[PDB]
Structure formats: C-alpha cells, structure tokens
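Students often ask what a 'structure token' actually looks like in practice. Rather than answer in the abstract, let us consider beta-trypsin, a protein of 223 residues. Its sequence is given first.
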Amino acid sequence: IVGGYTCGANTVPYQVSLNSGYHFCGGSLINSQWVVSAAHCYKSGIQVRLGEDNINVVEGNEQFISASKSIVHPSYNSNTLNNDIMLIKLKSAASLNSRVASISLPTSCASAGTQCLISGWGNTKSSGTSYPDVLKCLKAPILSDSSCKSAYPGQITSNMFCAGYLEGGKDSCQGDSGGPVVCSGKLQGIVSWGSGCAQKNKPGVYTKVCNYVSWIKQTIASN
Ligand SMILES: *[O-]C1=C(C2=[C][C]=[C][C]=[C]2)[C]=C(O[C])[C]=C1C1=[C]C2=[C]C(C([N])=[N+])=[C][C]=C2[N]1
Ligand SMILES: [Ca+2]
Ligand SMILES: [Cl-]
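Now compare that with the structural description of the same chain:
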C-alpha cells in the first residue's frame, strides 16, 4: 500500500496473508473454512495466516492453517485478468473472535463515490521495493466507469472496477494482490492489478465481487 497508514494490530480481522515461506498475497476470510483471494495468486504449498499484524514476528493471535484446496474461477484469463478470483478451502476451520472474523459478501454492487478500505503487506513505494512488517491501510473511493475506462481503454471488463486517486500517491501495489476492498462492511473488491503503483491517472483495478456472489455460494455449497 503506497500512501496508506498503519492499520493497528487486528483492526482488520478478516485480512489473511497467503504464505509459501514468505508473504506473496493477501486474501479475505468469508467463513471459518473459506478464504477468497485472486486467481493470479494461485500456487501449491499455501499456508493461510490469520490474525496477523507483524508478519515476521509471532505476537499472539495468529492461526496458521494449510489450504486443503484452491479453486481458481474456471473462466479466469491470465492475459486479461478477467475473473481474477479464487476460493481456498482451509484444512480445518479457524477459531473466530474479535481479532479473526469473516467479512460479509455484498447484496448489491457499490456505486462510484463509495469510500472503501484496502489493506495489505505489499510494497509501500511506487518507485522501488519497501515491504512493511505490519499491515497497512488505505481509504479510497470507487471511481466511475468512464474514468476507469478512460484510464485503461480496452482493458476493463464488467468484472472490474477502479478505485483510488487519479492524482497518484495513494494506491495498492504488489504484495497486496488478493486482498480486500471493503465498503460499508461488505467485501466489494479484490486487489487485482494496475500500471505501476500510485502513478498519476493509473488507478488500481479490482475484481468486482458482487458479480460472483452466486458463484462463490454455489461453489462452497458443493465442496
Ligand atoms: O500482484 C502482483 C504480482 C503477483 C503475481 C503472482 C503472484 C503474486 C503476486 C506480481 C507483480 O509483479 C509482476 C505485481 C503484482 C501487482 C501489481 C499491482 C499493482 C496494483 C496497483 N497499482 N493498484 C495492485 C496490485 C498489484 N499487484
Ligand atoms: Ca506475526
Ligand atoms: Cl473501452
């Protein structure tokens, strides 16, 4: 997260870190045995880490659970990143409390102007790599579709939305991929891509979760 602030230990209880010997992506806990992340974060050997703040220190509240299976959306396209969403089932259920909790799925899509919270342990520099130890947060608005399409002409599908600041300076970045975009207490987006990080006129692009709620529900229901 570039231009963000320190969230504070466990203030974002649904945030998870996907780890394969190091943190490579974020994710959101939607129920005690399922996490939602981005399809481009897929790999084998994933350990889901819940209740984290400082990812390099065990401080208490952490639950490390291995992934039992990862379900990348069948229509995921790695070239366009359309349908960039993945579900991970946990080997055992997590213990939920106030430090580890699930986030609700939306009932409706959000509208431009809605203010959301984006979090993660991704890079904090737009020009260079600086990865933090603790979780960073950023409050950003969802942009209108015209502004999004005008910034990324021909690359935005109906399963994507832009959120951020056209003036540059504040944005999500690599290491944040797979994590949450929560608005009014509902998971509305998944950190997916962008051109560089925090560049002017190049907002972040997120997977539009409201378009996948029935898919998520049906898939969990059958696995
Ligand atoms: O997400 C990501 C990855 C990545 C690939 C495969 C597994 C995990 C992570 C790699 C990468 O370097 C090639 C860059 C990203 C990445 C860039 C970026 C930018 C923005 C933005 N500008 N808002 C958001 C998210 C990401 N992810
Ligand atoms: Ca820790
Ligand atoms: Cl277009």
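One point worth highlighting: Residues 149, 153-154 surround chloride ion (ligand 3) (CB under 6 Å). Ask yourself how you might have guessed this from the sequence alone, and why that guess would often be unreliable.
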